[PDB]
Amino acid sequence: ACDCTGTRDGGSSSKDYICRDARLGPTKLPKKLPLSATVESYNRFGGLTPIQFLQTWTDEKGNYKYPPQNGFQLDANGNAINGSMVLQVGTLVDRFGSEYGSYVSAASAPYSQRALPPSNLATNPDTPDFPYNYHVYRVIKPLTVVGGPIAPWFGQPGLGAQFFTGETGNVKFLIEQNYLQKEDPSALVYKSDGCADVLF
Amino acid sequence: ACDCTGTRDGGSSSKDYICRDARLGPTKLPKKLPLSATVESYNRFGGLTPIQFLQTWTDEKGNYKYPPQNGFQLDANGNAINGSMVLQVGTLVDRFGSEYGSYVSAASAPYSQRALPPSNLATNPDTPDFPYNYHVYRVIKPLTVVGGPIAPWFGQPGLGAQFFTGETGNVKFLIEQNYLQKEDPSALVYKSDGCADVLF
Ligand SMILES: *[C@@H]1O[C@H](CO)[C@@H](O[C@@H]2O[C@H](CO)[C@@H](O[C@@H]3O[C@H](CO[C@H]4O[C@H](CO)[C@@H](O)[C@H](O)[C@@H]4O)[C@@H](O)[C@H](O[C@H]4O[C@H](CO)[C@@H](O)[C@H](O)[C@@H]4O)[C@@H]3O)[C@H](O)[C@H]2NC(C)=O)[C@H](O)[C@H]1NC(C)=O
Ligand SMILES: *[C@@H]1O[C@H](CO)[C@@H](O[C@@H]2O[C@H](CO)[C@@H](O[C@@H]3O[C@H](CO[C@H]4O[C@H](CO)[C@@H](O)[C@H](O)[C@@H]4O)[C@@H](O)[C@H](O[C@H]4O[C@H](CO)[C@@H](O)[C@H](O)[C@@H]4O)[C@@H]3O)[C@H](O)[C@H]2NC(C)=O)[C@H](O)[C@H]1NC(C)=O
Numbered sequence: 001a002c003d004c005t006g007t008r009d010g011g012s013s014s015k016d017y018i019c020r021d022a023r024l025g026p027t028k029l030p031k032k033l034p035l036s037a038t039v040e041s042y043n044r045f046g047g048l049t050p051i052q053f054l055q056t057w058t059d060e061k062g063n064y065k066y067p068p069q070n071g072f073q074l075d076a077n078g079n080a081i082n083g084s085m086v087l088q089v090g091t092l093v094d095r096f097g098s099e100y101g102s103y104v105s106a107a108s109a110p111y112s113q114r115a116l117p118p119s120n121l122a123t124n125p126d127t128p129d130f131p132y133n134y135h136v137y138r139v140i141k142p143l144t145v146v147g148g149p150i151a152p153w154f155g156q157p158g159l160g161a162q163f164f165t166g167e168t169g170n171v172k173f174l175i176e177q178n179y180l181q182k183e184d185p186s187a188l189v190y191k192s193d194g195c196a197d198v199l200f
Numbered sequence: 201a202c203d204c205t206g207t208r209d210g211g212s213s214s215k216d217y218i219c220r221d222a223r224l225g226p227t228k229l230p231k232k233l234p235l236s237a238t239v240e241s242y243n244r245f246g247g248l249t250p251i252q253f254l255q256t257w258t259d260e261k262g263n264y265k266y267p268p269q270n271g272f273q274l275d276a277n278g279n280a281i282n283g284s285m286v287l288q289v290g291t292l293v294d295r296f297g298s299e300y301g302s303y304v305s306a307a308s309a310p311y312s313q314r315a316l317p318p319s320n321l322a323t324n325p326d327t328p329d330f331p332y333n334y335h336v337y338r339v340i341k342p343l344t345v346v347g348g349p350i351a352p353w354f355g356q357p358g359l360g361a362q363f364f365t366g367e368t369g370n371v372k373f374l375i376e377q378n379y380l381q382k383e384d385p386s387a388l389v390y391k392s393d394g395c396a397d398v399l400f
Contacts, residue, residue, distance in 0.1 A: 002395040018400050027397065037308040038232045039336055039388045040292050047394040075283040076344055083281040085273055088352065092240050106313065106359040108237040113308050136239055144276055147349060149361045152288065159306040161349045161359040188239045194247040195202040197227065200218050 006051030008062065017122070019050060023062070025118030032129040032189055033121070036112040044118035046155010057117065057154050064117045064154070070103070071115060071162065073149040082148030082164075087139045092183070093163065094136045095171060096120040102166035104180075105150070107136055113160035115153040129186040135171075136188060137180040143168060206251030208262065217322070219250060223262070225318030232329040232389055233321070236312040244318035246355010257317065257354050264317045264354070270303070271315060271362065273349040282348030282364075287339045292383070293363065294336045295371060296320040302366035304380075305350070307336055313360035315353040329386040335371075336388060337380040343368060 004019035011020060018024035025044050029035065036042035045053040059065055072080035087093070093104035096116055105114055111121070124132040145163035152158035165174060174180040204219035211220060218224035225244050229235065236242035245253040259265055272280035287293070293304035296316055305314055311321070324332040345363035352358035365374060374380040 002399050004400060018397065027400075032238045034234070034237050034310075037234050037310070039294070039307050039385050041392055043392070043394040044397070045395055049395055073283075073285055073347065075285055077284075079283075081281075081283040081285060081348065083273075083275040083279075084277075085275055085281060085349075091352075092357065094239070106357065107239050108310055108313050108357050108359070110234075110237070110308055110310070113306065147273065148281065149285075149347060149349060152291075157292065157306065157308050159308070159361040161361070185239050192241055192243070194243040195245055195249055197218065197244070199202050200204060200227075 001049040001051065004050060006054055018044065022122060023054075023058070023064070023117070023119050024050060025121040026123055028123070029121060030123045030128065030130050032186065033131065033134070034110040036110050040112065040157060042110070042112050043155070048155060053155065064119070067115065067151045067153040070164065071151055071153065073151040073159070080148060082146050084144055085147045087143045087145055087163065089139060089142060091139045092136065093139065093180075094134065096131065096133050098133070099135070099171040099175065102164055102170045104137065104145075104163045104165060104171065106161040109160035112156050113150065113158055115150050115156045115158035115160070117154050127186065129189070134185065136183040136185045137171065137174075138183050139179065140181045141179050143174065143179045201249040201251065204250060206254055218244065222322060223258070223264070223317070223319050224250060225321040226323055228323070229321060230323045230328065230330050232386065233331065233334070234310040236310050240312065240357060242310070242312050243355070248355060253355065264319070267315065267351045267353040270364065271351055271353065273351040273359070280348060282346050284344055285347045287343045287345055287363065289339060289342060291339045292336065293339065293380075294334065296331065296333050298333070299335070299371040299375065302364055302370045304337065304345075304363045304365060304371065306361040309360035312356050313350065313358055315350050315356045315358035315360070317354050327386065329389070334385065336383040336385045337371065337374075338383050339379065340381045341379050343374065343379045
């Protein structure tokens with residue numbers, strides 16, 4: 001196939017999205033977000049055609065179906081792999097979504113490892129480096145979270161590290177209570193705190 | 201500081217390594233291995249100077265000190281976060297080291313997430329794309345493993361996903377018994393099984 005069959009044409013207003021269906025993500029990808037590793041290139045459809053991808057990962061209303069037990073990798077017995085762990089100061093976490101949510105992830109994992117639909121890659125044309133709903137935080141006070149591997153989903157390899165913060169509070173609470181600190185991702189790309197190899 | 205003080209000069213034979221000390225990794229890094237994400241550049245010393253890095257992560261003999269409980273992230277109670285999970289067919293795992301070991305990792309995690317010393321980045325000049333001890337496997341038969349997040353170590357963010365295969369066998373056993381399949385990483389960089397965005 002490899003066609004726009006089965007998608008939803010949003011019209012000229014959705015001209016910046018694949019098949020004009022914002023569910024399938026933008027035509028032009030974020031400029032500085034790592035989408036995958038070199039050994040396994042990113043594919044927004046998980047190697048499937050759009051209709052096969054929609055058939056597999058959407059419901060009758062066309063809304064994405066999301067992994068069970070909060071997206072943690074489930075053990076052999078069907079129970080999520082996780083555990084209460086402390087995030088050390090200086091750890092960098094990120095999130096796709098509003099601060100009223102309670103799930104952060106290890107920032108260094110490529111997008112293919114977060115097992116998130118391609119819609120989240122929609123990017124503000126004014127600040128095109130990272131998606132519009134993308135935020136980066138640095139823990140400034142040790143925060144215990146229930147952390148675990150991300151289950152593969154949406155045709156993505158997954159297996160990144162996610163952290164539920166709801167035992168303490170949502171991301172907004174963590175900022176207000178000095179647990180987390182908002183960072184500028186376009187400014188972090190230029191960061192280099194250490195000895196560069198050129199000094200040797 | 202930012203000097204070669206405290207390192208071990210290997211001489212002209214170690215001319216391709218930082219401070220001529222192969223413990224600190226090669227001067228020229230692998231050409232196709234993702235070392236970090238854009239938001240958190242890789243630093244072989246974890247933001248420290250070589251002597252501080254050696255002081256923190258080596259013992260009296262100069263050998264690297266390695267994380268406890270097989271490098272899994274430890275919970276609040278000091279117990280490793282892991283669990284028995286099945287690796288689905290098509291999953292890509294990698295390893296730094298010989299096939300007689302029993303630890304694979306999610307291949308898509310950048311090197312900063314594996315919490316491994318910079319020595320493993322030494323690269324064969326004949327095949328410079330990936331380190332010399334780097335192997336990539338694709339599971340061809342569902343393999344249950346005890347998988348978990350990687351604990352930060354060696355000044356690296358860690359938090360990648362590692363998988364102990366020893367309940368079934370070492371990587372050599374997995375190949376012999378058709379659980380895993382050896383892959384060519386320089387050949388996987390050119391792989392693209394799916395619909396490219398240019399078709400839309
Ligand atoms: C980290 O991973 C762990 C391990 O899986 C998850 O823990 C599970 O959490 C869910 C939600 O709290 C638990 O499901 C609930 O269990 C109740 C009974 O629990 C006892 O019995 C079971 C027997 O299987 C034991 O495993 C368990 O330890 C307790 O002894 C039920 O009463 C609940 O039913 C209600 O909620 C469900 C929601 O699914 C509704 O469908 C029902 O109608 C009803 O309203 C519920 O099923 C589950 O038992 C926990 N598992 C284990 C092994 O303890 C964590 O949630 C996870 N953490 C994060 C952040 O994802
Ligand atoms: C995945 O993560 C789990 C959770 O931590 C790890 O399980 C631990 O594994 C180690 C090694 O097998 C266990 O340590 C051993 O425990 C023995 C007693 O176990 C009972 O009592 C403890 C009380 O704390 C309970 O936690 C446990 O469930 C049992 O009821 C000791 O006899 C052993 O001592 C011997 O070995 C140690 C090695 O450290 C030597 O220092 C000693 O001298 C002695 O020779 C040993 O301590 C540990 O108890 C397990 N933890 C839990 C919570 O069960 C898995 O290992 C990990 N998987 C991987 C692949 O990393």
